[PDB]
Amino acid sequence: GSQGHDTVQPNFQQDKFLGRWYSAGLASNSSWFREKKAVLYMCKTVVAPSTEGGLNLTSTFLRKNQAETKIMVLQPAGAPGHYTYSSPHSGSIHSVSVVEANYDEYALLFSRGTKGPGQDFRMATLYSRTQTLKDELKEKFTTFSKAQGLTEEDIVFLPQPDKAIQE
Ligand SMILES: CCCCC[C@H](O)/C=C/[C@@H]1[C@@H](C/C=C\CCCC(=O)O)[C@H]2CO[C@@H]1C2
Secondary structure: OOOOOOOOOOOOHHHHHOOEEEEEEEEEOHHHHHHHOOOOOOOEEEEEEEOOOOEEEEEEEEOOOOOOOEEEEEEOOOEEEEEEOOOOOOOOOOOOOOOOOOOOOEEEEEEOOOOOOOOOOEEEEEEEEEOOOHHHHHHHHHHHHHHHHHOOOOOOOOOOOOOOOOO
C-alpha cells in the first residue's frame, strides 16, 4: 500500500539540464491520452532555450510504428519547479513541475494540465543524459507515480523500436 498527492523539489538548475536527451521513462495520468501512449516508442528529445527567453523541447521520431516531429515551449512560473508550455488543445495550455531531477545524472519532470474543460491530465517524463538505468531515477519516478496515480498503460520506458516496414 501507498499514498501521496504530489510534491516538487525547489532548486532546479537548467544549466545542467537543458539540452539534448534520450528517452528512458515516461508516464501519463490521462484516460484518453493513454490510448495513444501505447503507440509512442523510443525517439529523440532535446530542450533548448526558446527564442522568447525560455525553453523549447523539440521531439522527433522517424519510422517504427509512427513518425513524430513536434516541439513545445516551456516557460518558468514563479517557483523553480513550476513552468508551463503551450501544448495541443486549441489554446495550448500546459504546466510542468520538477519532482526531483539530479545533476549530471538524469532529468525528471511531471506535466499536468488544468483547464476549464476539467481535463486535469498529468504526465511524467524521464530524460536520460547517459542512456543507463538509474536505481534512484527508476525508484523515484516509479514510486512517485503512485502518488501521481500513474497508469500501467501510460508508462513508457524506452520501448523497443523493432517496428519494421513502418517507413
Ligand atoms: C501534450 C504534451 C506532449 C509532450 C510530448 C513530449 O514532448 C514527447 C516526448 C517523447 C515521446 C515520443 C514522442 C511523441 C509521441 C506522440 C504520440 C502521439 O501520437 O500522441 C517519448 C519518447 O521520448 C519522449 C517520450
